[PDB]
Design a protein around this ligand. Structure first.
Ligand SMILES: COc1nc2ccc(Br)cc2cc1[C@@H](c1ccccc1)[C@@](O)(CCN(C)C)c1cccc2ccccc12
Lengths: 223, 105, 41, 74, 44, 77, 45, 38, 75, 75, 75, 75, 75, 75, 75, 75
């Protein structure tokens, strides 16, 4: 009854969760022209400013992912922002979807660190200026954290959009309860919901930039 | 082909003007408006749109949206133009220069 | 079913073959996890 | 095309193929895109009218849940 | 823009269905008001 | 303000008795459309328009429904 | 990075006003003597 | 927690892969930045 | 029931970990105030670090709300 | 009896998480004193960062009162 | 009566939240001693930020004493 | 009796609030050392801040001992 | 009966050790902001330490989260 | 006997307030290094502040161990 | 049983000591950024102090994880 | 029994005191890197304080690992 906005949506027995995951790309029109409209002029600028941010820090092999790590910050920042609409089912609150964006991009990042350049990837586990006599303890950290980075991504994003929606939905129910009670209090609980919606707008973008930065930093440490 | 210069003249960013003119003749100026209040008051009376916690999270994300549009609209409205009348001028300029490098030559 | 080659795979050809080759090796790992998680449930 | 027809045969006149109704969306998209989005000096209302038709869809499937929270019973 | 004369049957039809409503709003209000209180009482 | 009132004073007012004859005249118009089938003459353009104005006037019955009970959200009891 | 450095000035221009301010607050017994021992006469071509 | 109902996971995994990897990227390959002229 | 009663103790104890991330957002947004009064020309590059520090510290608090809700509701 | 009792043990143990927001607000308004004594011309630019760093502390302070509410009322 | 016994551990554990407002008033008046040593000319304006930063951190501390005095006396 | 057993866990948990006033006195008398080593000409004024800051820090720490000695003995 | 009830309390306590990493990652990215604003020509080498610090503080917090589950699920 | 077994919890939980002092002594002797690496000719007077701070925080770390020994044996 | 039950709250609360080594590794690797932004020509000697501080703070974390795995499986 | 059960909860909640001996050892060696990078001419005398601070904050951690091994083995 409380987690209702996270159950897979179905209308007329049809799994409507597919027309919701495939919609974000519909808000990004493209054109071959040279001078287009305001939408594609602002979007092609954001993609320019974004790609120059995540990708500048990479070498030539890391920059071959400049289509992936840009088409990923565009898909997470548009799925989150389409979740703040009323009653909307944002599929980034799903541990299934988030585990499907996290494991491949991570596994495909350490594999290229183990299928090639492996002898160099063996040197990140042991920092440069490290004395020896307590190495058999540090080996646990750099591996067990590596083995849990793919689950850090998918849960840092799941637990931040879920908890952001749960809070806005509870504080919302508060204003509904104090509506039939002292009303000058309703307006102070509501203005908390407004400052909270401006926060959930920012955390809708920040959680997209951090997800695609930590996938970038994993890549930078394997190319 | 050249793009047009204006869109669809939509009122309240939700209902296009092709609707008001479509109902203006038979029902007049206040025709479509009273339909709105007629549907909303019917919706939330027969519990079609049931007031829930989402009602007050709707008004908030609609309040921030209608205020971000009114406060940051005109700034983005022209910034999208200046990116063009710069990229346009940046071409026409070099275009003329590219003649000097062939006129002098 | 043409232009599914031209519009849909001709562009993605240099990526789906060379660049994202190790992605799919990871995407197999993921599919093994999802089925296993659903197998124990 | 409709908005000027009157017959119930039009419902069966149309091309109801897997490629048929797609061309009715791809043409229904370019008729919208060209009207509100693909113009210089376009306004935000080309988008805030898609979201408004995306909430009504996000609410339509979410009504089977909100009905358990009516504050009346009649 | 000057106002427009609305068709007559629609013009009174508003008040036609209006008083039909306040009547129907009176009947079912007085029909459900008694029925409810015992369901609230018998719920105890 | 005054603009909504400036327009209300023409069509948001009780009708004249002189319009009742021509009102039932149009009532007989659409009923003859039901007898022989002049509904087949209607193109979809104004066909929906007659439907919306029907839902238009129908909501008057519901805003009158809620005023006959002094309650907005459903029946108070 | 102070405000004047953001405003284009340099520490020489900063010091010329701070030192002028001290002299402008000197008393008349010393203000005449102190101004000529530090006044400027050089000129740019 | 309805995120744990693993019966509707393949309904979230496949339409994501069909978007993050084929539809969103295809629309990026159409966004090109030409080099400036002389 | 002692099993359903022990859920409220663990769930209420699990969410104490949000005290950590509530104290690391004051360090970040406190360091931004210090680091911006020393090089106010880097205003945009510092704020791009207050963001990464915000989300990576706050994330560690929600890992406690995860177990606060994994216990309280989903066993 | 134990179910309605195990809530005060879980509710009170959940409003501890706002301790982190008492230290996060200290470090924020503690760096506004250090950052303003360094560049007293940015008194209005820094103070707007302190209000931002202070507001974001209530954010992580509310995530606790939520789980302190659910355990207490909406079990 | 396991009811009023759980209202003791509630107030007893809900008052641990004051450990934040004890280490937040330490960083406000601690960083006032540091910031005032650098620019002692602003003694007045710094002390007006300490009182503002001490209260905003102590407020988040009294809210725990207010909660501990609800689980114990009110309900 | 269980109340006599709950008053012990109620008090033994309230005294954890003193852990704040123990890290908040190390930040006041730790920022006097950093603040005095810089400007040692203000020793008689930096100190009279490290007494206000030390009194306003143990105050919020002795509340949690007053609460302990209010649960443990005095109802 | 109680052997499972204790696995909801022992797991709710183990997961509060993550609070030590919500404050660690804040100190790491609260120093990448200060340290940068002083020597902004070492951005490539400071960030390479803020990541080493973010990974080593998070690696301690996630030990708690692993003992949280290794108690709640394994034994 | 539920009370004698409760004393082992209230006395084992009161002694975690010591973790406040132990963190306010590393701040003091970590500020003595930052304040002595700047003005080392003050080594005498700094060390007479790193003892007033060490002996004022570690007094709060003893008020906790005082209640830990007040519940464990004095009752 | 009540032994196999309490040995889960014990080994589940003993592992909160890792919350120390979470914020001790965040300060060591946080101040290494500030120690390097100041004197980057000592990068080899600084990083050898960070690894000493990372191995001595984490060793206090292991001493807690060592106890939780002592009152669980050892005895 | 009920005692041998609570003896594990008290000895577990007491060794959380090490969480303050892990944030101290972190701050001491966090200032040894900052203090030595500022005045590397004092390497031998700054390090002679970072051993005192290491031993004095870790002495409050032993006070908790001692009261843990008192309820656990002595009584
Ligand atoms: C004024 O205080 C605030 N400032 C904020 C600043 C920014 C943001 Br984004 C959220 C803020 C939220 C609030 C309060 C608030 C007031 C009304 C409704 C909701 C929230 C608060 O949450 C305090 C948060 N602290 C204490 C954890 C609160 C919650 C619950 C009960 C309270 C009782 C009394 C006082 C405050 C109470």
């Amino acid at each position: 009854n409380l987690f209702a906005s996270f159950i897979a949506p179905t209308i007329l027995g049809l799994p409507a969760a597919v027309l919701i995951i495939l919609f974000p790309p519909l808000l990004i029109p493209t054109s071959k022209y040279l001078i287009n409209n305001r939408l594609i002029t602002t979007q092609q600028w954001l993609i320019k400013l974004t790609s120059k941010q995540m990708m500048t820090m990479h070498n030539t092999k890391g920059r071959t992912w400049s289509l992936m790590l840009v088409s990923l910050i565009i898909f997470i920042a548009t799925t989150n922002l389409l979740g703040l609409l009323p009653h909307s089912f944002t599929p980034t609150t799903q541990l299934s979807m988030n585990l499907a964006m996290a494991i491949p991009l991570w596994a495909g990042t350490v594999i290229m660190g183990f299928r090639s350049k492996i002898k160099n990837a063996l040197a990140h586990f042991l920092p440069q200026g490290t004395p020896t006599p307590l190495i058999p303890m540090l080996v646990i950290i750099e591996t067990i954290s590596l083995l849990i980075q793919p689950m850090a991504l998918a849960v840092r994003l799941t637990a931040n959009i879920t908890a952001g929606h749960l809070l806005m939905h509870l504080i919302g129910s508060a204003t509904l309860a104090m509506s039939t009670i002292n009303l000058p209090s309703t307006l102070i609980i509501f203005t908390i919901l407004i400052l909270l919606t401006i926060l959930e707008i920012a955390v809708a973008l920040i959680q997209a930039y951090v997800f695609t930065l930590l996938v970038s930093l994993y890549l930078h440490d394997n190319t | 082909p050249p793009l047009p210069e204006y869109g669809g003249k939509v009122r309240y960013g939700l209902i296009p003007e092709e609707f008001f003119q479509f109902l203006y003749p038979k029902t007049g100026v206040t025709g479509p408006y009273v339909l709105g209040t007629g549907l909303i008051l019917y919706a939330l009376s027969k519990e079609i749109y049931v007031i829930s916690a989402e009602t007050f999270t709707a008004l908030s994300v609609l309040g921030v949206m209608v205020y971000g549009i009114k406060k940051y609209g005109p700034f983005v409205a022209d910034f999208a133009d200046k990116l063009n009348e710069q990229k346009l001028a940046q071409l026409e300029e070099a275009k003329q220069a590219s003649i000097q490098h062939i006129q002098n030559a | 079913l043409q232009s599914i080659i031209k519009n849909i795979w001709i562009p993605m050809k240099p990526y789906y073959t060379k660049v994202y080759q190790e992605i799919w090796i990871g995407m197999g790992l993921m599919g093994f996890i999802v089925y296993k998680i659903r197998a124990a449930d | 095309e409709v908005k000027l027809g009157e017959l119930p045969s039009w419902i069966l006149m149309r091309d109801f193929s897997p490629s048929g109704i797609f061309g009715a969306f791809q043409r229904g998209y370019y008729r919208y895109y060209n009207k509100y989005i693909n113009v210089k000096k376009g306004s935000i209302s080309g988008i805030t009218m898609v979201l408004a038709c995306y909430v009504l869809f996000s609410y339509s499937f979410s009504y089977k849940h909100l009905k358990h929270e009516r504050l009346r019973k009649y | 823009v000057p106002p427009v004369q609305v068709s007559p049957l629609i013009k009174l039809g508003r008040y036609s269905a209006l008083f039909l409503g306040v009547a129907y709003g009176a009947t079912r209000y007085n029909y459900l008001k008694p029925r409810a209180e015992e369901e609230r009482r018998i719920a105890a | 303000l005054a603009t909504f009132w400036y327009y209300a004073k023409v069509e948001l007012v009780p009708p004249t008795p002189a319009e009742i004859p021509r009102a039932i005249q149009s009532l007989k118009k659409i009923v003859n459309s039901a007898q022989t089938g002049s509904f087949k003459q209607l193109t979809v353009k104004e066909a929906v328009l007659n439907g919306l104005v029907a839902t238009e006037v129908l909501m008057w019955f519901y805003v009158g429904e809620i005023i006959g009970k002094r309650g907005i959200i459903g029946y108070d009891v | 990075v102070a405000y004047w450095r953001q405003a284009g000035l340099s520490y020489i221009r900063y010091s010329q006003i701070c030192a002028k301010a001290v002299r402008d607050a000197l008393k008349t017994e010393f203000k005449a003597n102190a101004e000529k021992t530090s006044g400027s006469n050089v000129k740019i071509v | 927690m309805p995120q744990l109902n693993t019966t509707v996971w393949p309904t979230m995994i496949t339409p994501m892969l069909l978007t993050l990897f084929l539809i969103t990227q295809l629309k990026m390959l159409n966004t090109n930045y030409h080099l400036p002229p002389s | 029931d002692i099993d359903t009663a022990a859920k409220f103790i663990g769930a209420g104890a699990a969410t104490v970990g949000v005290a950590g991330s509530g104290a690391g957002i004051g360090t970040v947004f406190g360091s931004l105030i210090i680091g911006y009064a020393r090089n106010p020309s880097l205003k945009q590059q510092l704020f791009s670090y207050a963001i990464l520090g915000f989300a990576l510290s706050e994330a560690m608090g929600l890992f406690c709300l995860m177990v606060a809700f994994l216990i309280l509701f989903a066993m």
